[PDB]
Amino acid sequence: SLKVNILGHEFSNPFMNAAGVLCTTEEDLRRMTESESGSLIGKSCTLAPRTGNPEPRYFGLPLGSINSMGLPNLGVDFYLSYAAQTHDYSRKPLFLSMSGLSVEESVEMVKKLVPITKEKGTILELNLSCPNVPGKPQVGYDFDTTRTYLQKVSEAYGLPFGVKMPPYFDIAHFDMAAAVLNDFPLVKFITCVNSIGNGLVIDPANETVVIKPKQGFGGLGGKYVLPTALANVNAFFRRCPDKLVFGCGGVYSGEEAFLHILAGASMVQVGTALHDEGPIIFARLNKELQEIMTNKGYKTLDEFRGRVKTM
């Protein structure tokens, strides 16, 4: 059994898309709904539509991806209408990611979600980590600013929600981040992690960067990020015992999913690998994770979630 029971919902399996991959348009979301994924999440949205950064803004790499999309999205009203009128909740639960570029914008957006969450059960993931908007640094790397967002969003939304965090690389930062998150009881899950921000890829043949925005600087995903993701998942799993942790980063196989769950993940998100392979990946992921559990004698994910062994 791959089932996950959290937030009052039954999820058929722990897999979903990472925000931003296969979730921007109505057709994208249809394809995620029809897939074997246990859930799905809408593109991080803004109050008004955006077309995003200029091209080229995505480059697939042997070890993953680099991107600077720039939050292209159809605007909050599109995703709310999708959540209210279009999505088939009998197939699977639905998350929406919101990434207002100011606390005021984020507050306006979540207020609109309230009635739809109440009526339909739509779940909010507040994005505190977009690394690709020029002039808008990651909110999650300023703990005073993070505290402000969480306060104002908690007050405006007033229902349980989650947060998408940037990756941290210092034990003191894990402690400081957890201290802020633990002051907000409505934050019921933490998604670790967003892209490793502001990497640079250069093509040796033409001596040129591979993406146009920000002088070539963009978010890294895929195989580059697995050990970082696992560390963040485990660090918050241990520091935030009354919250759930969702794993995101470097998942290409059931084995990586198993590691995320062992580190403490309740749901497992798939970005770069899904971009590479398409939504058929979720069928493969379910099969591979089931095999591993079968071979190890695990009847349910609860038997090993967060049970990574240390020396």
Next chain:
Amino acid sequence: MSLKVNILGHEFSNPFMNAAGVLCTTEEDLRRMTESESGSLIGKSCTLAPRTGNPEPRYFGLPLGSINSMGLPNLGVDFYLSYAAQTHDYSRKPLFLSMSGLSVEESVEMVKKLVPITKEKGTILELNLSCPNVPGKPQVGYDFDTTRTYLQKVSEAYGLPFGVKMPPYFDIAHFDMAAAVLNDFPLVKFITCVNSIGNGLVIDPANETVVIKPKQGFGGLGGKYVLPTALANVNAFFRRCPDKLVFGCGGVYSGEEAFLHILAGASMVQVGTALHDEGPIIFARLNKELQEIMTNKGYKTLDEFRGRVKTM
């Protein structure tokens, strides 16, 4: 054709050296680096008193790199100063020493001891603001107020040009903030980008157990994991600190990666994980591979393409 680099008052035969921490802890390590084809070498980050470091296992080689939590094992500052003063053959190549005191008071005492040896022998200082593996000691480089303090106290105590080993940054505001601090210290002549990507976690799916013992399995990542991060940091500081040099460190396994670092702005190129895997023979291979790339492109010197990465 030439791989020569003229910086810091020296002619380096080529841009390659070890990354601090790899093949540089013992006298025997340092001899092997000196005998290698490397353009330079740097001593293990040291502390005022000797350290044996963390318990085993504390290093694990990976298909895409390495994870470690060594814990700053080193023979103590007096050993490296004595190596620099009496043992090192400067006719072979210049010497850097890395210092990583666990408090600013410790660093000040260490750099004061270095002053006369730098004056006499020309030994170069790299101040480590980024060790991610000592429990309870966060990266100084991730606190810009603390960084300003270290740089003020070390500038005042040492009083000669030196460099800094920085942790990797992942946010444009952080590049801006880091550069604003570094640009206030004229004695900071070079910036080495980057130290390990800190506090990664590797788990073996077969036994469900982490692969290193210290810090519940959390350790710094090196190798293929870090190349795009290293290139970004190199280029970000190359642009923001035009009065300083940048050294590249991270993800170098071949002449191709070295070429990319130099294109991004690197004056010297440091090799960590790949050197740990291959041994000091790697430097001969790197020189050959970089020259081959230059030959194919029609470049005669590094100066022809250093910092000339193109954007769109």
